[PDB]
Amino acid sequence: HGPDPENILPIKGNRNLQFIKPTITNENILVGEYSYYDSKRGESFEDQVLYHYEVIGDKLIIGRFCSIGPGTTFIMNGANHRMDGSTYPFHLFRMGWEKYMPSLKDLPLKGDIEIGNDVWIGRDVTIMPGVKIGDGAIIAAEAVVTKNVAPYSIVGGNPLKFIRKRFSDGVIEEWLALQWWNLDMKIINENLPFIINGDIEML
Amino acid sequence: HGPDPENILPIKGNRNLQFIKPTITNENILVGEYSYYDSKRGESFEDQVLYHYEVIGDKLIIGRFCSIGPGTTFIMNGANHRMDGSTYPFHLFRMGWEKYMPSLKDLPLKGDIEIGNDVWIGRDVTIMPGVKIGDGAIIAAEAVVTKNVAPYSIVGGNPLKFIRKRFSDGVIEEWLALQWWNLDMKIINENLPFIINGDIEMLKRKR
Amino acid sequence: HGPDPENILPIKGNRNLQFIKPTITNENILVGEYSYYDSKRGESFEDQVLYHYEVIGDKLIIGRFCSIGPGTTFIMNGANHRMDGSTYPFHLFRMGWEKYMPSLKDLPLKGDIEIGNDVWIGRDVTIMPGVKIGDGAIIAAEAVVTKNVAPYSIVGGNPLKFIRKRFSDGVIEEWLALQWWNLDMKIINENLPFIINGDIEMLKRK
Ligand SMILES: C=CC[C@@H]1/C=C/C(=O)NC/C=C/C(C)=C/[C@@H](O)C[C@@H](F)Cc2nc(co2)C(=O)N2CCC[C@@H]2C(=O)O[C@@H]1C(C)C
Ligand SMILES: C=CC[C@@H]1/C=C/C(=O)NC/C=C/C(C)=C/[C@@H](O)C[C@@H](F)Cc2nc(co2)C(=O)N2CCC[C@@H]2C(=O)O[C@@H]1C(C)C
Ligand SMILES: C=CC[C@@H]1/C=C/C(=O)NC/C=C/C(C)=C/[C@@H](O)C[C@@H](F)Cc2nc(co2)C(=O)N2CCC[C@@H]2C(=O)O[C@@H]1C(C)C
Ligand SMILES: [Cl-]
Ligand SMILES: [Cl-]
Ligand SMILES: [Cl-]
Ligand SMILES: [Cl-]
Ligand SMILES: [Mg+2]
């Protein structure tokens, strides 16, 4: 009962909104069930993952029941130039320069992009490398995620600046202990009214 | 005398700059005459009004003699998820979930977008829901209008941050008292030199 | 030895990255050699220079060995309305309104855009009119360059906000004194290892 997490186009007539997990073809992208991307021009979610080279080996991770707004892009670590001296990538143009190859140790690598569950990412959000976003958080439109985002907090702007927390410090502990996105689907369905309207305490 | 406010493409040869009023087909959009949109790629002004659902009933109201720059978008209220608990729009995917439908009282609805007259909205500006922007203001390119914008003030950034007021308080009080955009068109042409070169005192003398 | 600065597509198979200098067909668009533009869908670098009217005469000047990222745009001075009174460009619509034409002394003109050498401009950067950006600087992706950028400083945001200086003051003084981008090309290849890894003690020595 509920849509098929493995069905790419779960909304009839709607060719723009896609469940991400079934469309992932490149490795190192790990997107949980039911998370979706609402595309501007109907293009694939993978087209929004930028500068993702297999040699650098970083991953992009997203949990379940995330909504990702149209135009959101993910700047993977391969985008960063070397910074010890000249940023110019001489080795790319070869003809004698190909022998000046940086290695992983020579680059400002920053780790994985880790986004939790039930995250609402707005429209045209740009996500910088190595960033961690917590569960239940809300990124505003046009945001540029430049620091980590705490669970169940609202953020937005460029550079990212904190706005507020969604619930009292105690109530957030409740959602994080609940972890409904992991509960058995037969159980999630029995409780969706409360997951949706926020009355968590009824469980 | 002057161009036709009702002519979609008022510049010869130009196919991107459009007078908005005559193009409006969909409801809950009220743009005043002579306001125009400079398109990036020929896209219509309405193409730039996003998440506008007739079921939510919010409106986009723009005044007269406004210049809305290429790529500007208007995030209407339908864009906001419910925020009591999970922000995930379960009901959209149906298959039993379609009964978990929110009501208007359940959503974070913030009211209309109200834009004044003689407003210069820059290129690639995102306007958030429920925002008011006063007469004669100037929105910098690439801005994200997140709070109200006072009349005859320059603003820009993401989030929106205040830069400066265009004229002194006493001078802004006069332009708003004047309201040159509402005068009969026979009178706007008679004073167009002074409307253009900022001479509120000369207009005062002729009023 | 090294690629041809005059070859439009210097990377085999790649059809998006282009050396800018050989792809300029208009005057007052001075980009130094080896500077390149990595395009989103194959658009040219000039396509990204907006509101550039020859009647206004401002120029866009970019140095050498610069990396201008996909989607960057350069707002030239023609973009600014007149701000004495109504910002509405009546004259454009003609039919009696063309007689109300502004002059150059009537517009908020701010001068050329001057970008230095070895500058890393990130992806989707907007550059406002009249701005200067110093040598070796790094502009973060999605930035809106609204004020000048000092040499060898990292900046980003909207509006632009200062992050940090790449090296100590004494070290930046040296790179600017050095000016490795202006040296003869026979010498740049001889020191490329140290230009790349910033062995300034070795560079001064040589
Ligand atoms: C272990 C370190 C990987 C190492 C290169 C590192 C390096 O120089 N990284 C700095 C990044 C520079 C960027 C993103 C520059 C943009 O301004 C233009 C490019 F986007 C154009 C373009 N990139 C590619 C092809 O075309 C391209 O293939 N790459 C870009 C970085 C990763 C990859 C590459 O050359 O990896 C090498 C592999 C093969 C040993
Ligand atoms: C009285 C409240 C109206 C109520 C539901 C409102 C509601 O759930 N609003 C939250 C907004 C969610 C958004 C913007 C989610 C994006 O991540 C993806 C969507 F954009 C994709 C998409 N939207 C639609 C079709 O496809 C779509 O039809 N709608 C989106 C909001 C309005 C409308 C809708 O479901 O209205 C209902 C009517 C019909 C009973
Ligand atoms: C010595 C001063 C030059 C003078 C007028 C300058 C002037 O009024 N500048 C203010 C800028 C207004 C802008 C950028 C308005 C946007 O909202 C829509 C336009 F982009 C649409 C559009 N522009 C054009 C054609 O279509 C267009 O031809 N121009 C725009 C500014 C330069 C140029 C122009 O009118 O130059 C005149 C010459 C020819 C006598
Ligand atoms: Cl790329
Ligand atoms: Cl993009
Ligand atoms: Cl939409
Ligand atoms: Cl233009
Ligand atoms: Mg900011």
- The rounded Cα A122 to chain-centroid distance in angstroms is 11
Distance CA A66, CA A142 (A): 17
CA atoms in the 13 A half-sphere facing the CB of A59: 10
Q: What are phi and psi of B66, to 5 degrees?
A: -100, 145
The distance from CA C85 to its chain's CA centroid, rounded to whole angstroms, is 32
| Dist. CA B130–CA B150, nearest whole Å | 15
Determined by X-ray
Per DSSP, C130 falls in state T
Tokens 């390149």 -> residue: C36
Please calculate the CA angle A141-A144-A83 and round it to the nearest 5 degrees: 165
> Can A1 be counted among the known catalytic residues?
no
Strand-by-strand arrangement of the B73-75 sheet: B49-50, B73-75, B126-127, B144-145
Query: Considering A1, A52, A81, A91, which one is annotated as catalytic?
Result: A81
DSSP summary character for residue A11: S
The first and second tokens of residue A68, run together, are 């990702």
Choose the closest CB to B96 out of A2, A142, A143: A2
Please, are residues B33 and B57 in contact by the beta-carbon 8 Å criterion?
Answer: no
> What distance in Å separates residue A57's CA from the closest CA in chain B?
31
How far is the first Cα of chain B from the last one, in angstroms, to the nearest whole number? Answer: 21
Q: What is the resolution of this structure in A?
A: 3.0
Q: Do residues B156 and B147 lie in contact, with contact meaning Cβ atoms separated by under 8 Å?
A: no
- How many whole angstroms separate alpha carbon C20 and alpha carbon C9? 10
Q: Please tell me the distance from the alpha carbon of residue B51 to that of residue B160, in angstroms, as a whole number.
A: 21
- CB–CB of A64/A96 below 8 Å? no
Q: Which amino acid makes up residue A8? A: I
- Which one-letter DSSP state was computed for residue A125? -
Contact assignment for A67 to B88 by CB distance below 8 Å: yes
CA A10 – CA A123 distance, rounded (Å): 20
Q: Which of A28, A7, A19 is nearest to A112 (CA)?
A: A28
The 3-class SS string of C12-72 reads: CCCCCEEECHHHCCCCCEEECCCCEEECCCCCCCHHHEECCCCCCCCCEEECCCCEECCCC
Answer for the pair B137, A134: CB distance below 8 angstroms, yes or no: no
| Of residues C87, C102, C158, nearest to B120 (C-beta) | C87
Tokens in use for B77?
């209220």
Q: Strand C153-156 relative to strand A120-121: parallel, antiparallel, unpaired?
A: unpaired
Amino acid at position C2, single letter: G
Give the C-alpha distances (Å, rounded to integers) separating B203 from A201, B1, B135, B179, C91: 65, 20, 18, 11, 20
The CA distance from C100 to A99, in Å, is 61
Burial of A12 (0-12, 13-18, 19+ CB in 10 A): exposed
Domain count, chain B: 1
CA distance C108 to C115: 21
- Find out whether the beta carbon of B168 lies less than 6 Å from any atom of ligand 3: no
- 8-state DSSP, B128: -
Hey, which residues does B121 pair with through a beta bridge? Answer: B68, B139
Taking the C-alpha atoms of residue B67 and residue B113, their distance in angstroms, rounded to an integer, is: 16
Residue B155 CB: number of other CB atoms within 10 A?
21
Domain containing B189: what range?
1-207
Q: Taking ligand 6, which is a single-atom ion, which protein residues have CB atoms under 5 Å away?
A: B 50
Place of tokens 């040869």: B13
Q: Please tell me the distance from the alpha carbon of residue A55 to that of residue A78, in angstroms, as a whole number.
A: 9
Residues 6+ apart with CB under 8 A from B44: B18, B23, B37
Tell which atom from ligand 2 comes closest to the C-alpha of A36. Answer: 17
- How many Å lie between the alpha carbon of A158 and the closest alpha carbon of chain C? 5
